[PDB]
Amino acid sequence: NATEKLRLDIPVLLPGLPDSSDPCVERLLSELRGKEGVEAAHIKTANVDSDSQICVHYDPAAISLARIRELVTSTGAVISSRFGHVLWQLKGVWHERRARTVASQLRALPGVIEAEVSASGIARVEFDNDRISAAGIEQALSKRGLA
Structure with missing residues (x-):
């Protein structure tokens, strides 16, 4: 119309x-x-x-x-x-189980909104740029994985 x-x-x-x-x-x-x-x-x-x-x-x-x-x-x-995004290929070997634990570790960080780790360790995250940056995401997942 x-x-x-x-x-x-x-x-x-x-x-x-x-x-x-x-x-x-x-x-x-x-x-x-x-x-x-x-x-x-x-x-x-x-x-x-x-x-x-x-x-x-x-x-x-x-x-x-x-x-x-x-x-x-x-x-x-x-x-x-x-809203920021990184899609990183983490090092190491993953399984439905292992990914699912690190998924929760990402969620619990101070600025993360959505987080989805697949098998083979591809991390799909979304974050609040006023609370956290991607450098701060890498430094927090530095302990275990990296880029």
Whole structure:
């Protein structure tokens, strides 16, 4: 109907995510859905993941294009600056069991949000840049593993 749509590429809003399933994408979308004038917001998936977009539908009687796009790009800027990610290949040999213990050690560090260690010791972490950095993550997992 009167609804208009705009799309932007995810890596443009949210540079340096492991994939488009990183919870930063959901943070962005759920925050946008809370704003007046947004009729919808959702991901448009690309086969090559870094060509995935967000698509936002808005009511141009409630909000101008300039203003909806600013809301999108600035909400993205704040999420992007606030949440860090490292995806590290740890040394040593892992098993469903062993990974699952170090998973909990990561969670318990002062600035970590989400943490997922697989078999073969690939650590997928997400962290609060105002509480901790990645150097501080490496130094804390230095004891056992490393990079």
